[PDB]
């Protein structure tokens, strides 16, 4: 009864950011994962440098693969506020980011290769 539940595979979008691989997980203060007509959730962004956030359930899609990446980027881009942002989330990822990025779907794939109880076990990160 809910588009998403504890270990599901999302992309997440945030304004400057890529669209990113993220888990679904319970955020370790309030002990849930979600929670007035819009949805939020708790997600943990896959990188190397994992972190998390409550994102809106609008910026939001399920994660079939690295597959979905550019047309993502297309449709936020689409019409993105700026146009510096439009052509920056259209040219492919610079800097420190996207080493991060890349590090990002290893993760996804490697993580949607297994089932819920693993793939949490192994991937909701300790701080």
Not at 65 to 87: D, H, N, R, V, W
Not at 99 to 113: C, D, L, N
């Amino acid at each position: 009864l809910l588009k998403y539940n504890v270990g599901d595979l999302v992309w997440s979008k945030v304004s400057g950011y890529p669209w990113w691989p993220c888990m679904v997980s319970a955020d370790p203060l309030l002990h849930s994962y979600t929670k007035k007509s819009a949805r939020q959730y708790h997600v943990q962004f896959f990188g190397d440098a994992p972190e998390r956030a409550w994102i809106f359930e609008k910026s939001l899609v399920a994660f079939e693969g690295e597959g979905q990446f550019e047309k993502l980027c297309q449709e936020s881009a689409k019409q993105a506020p700026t146009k510096a942002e439009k052509i920056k989330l259209l040219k492919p990822i610079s800097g420190k980011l996207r080493a991060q990025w890349e590090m990002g779907i290893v993760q996804a794939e490697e993580a949607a290769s297994m089932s819920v109880e693993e793939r949490k076990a192994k991937f909701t990160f300790l701080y």
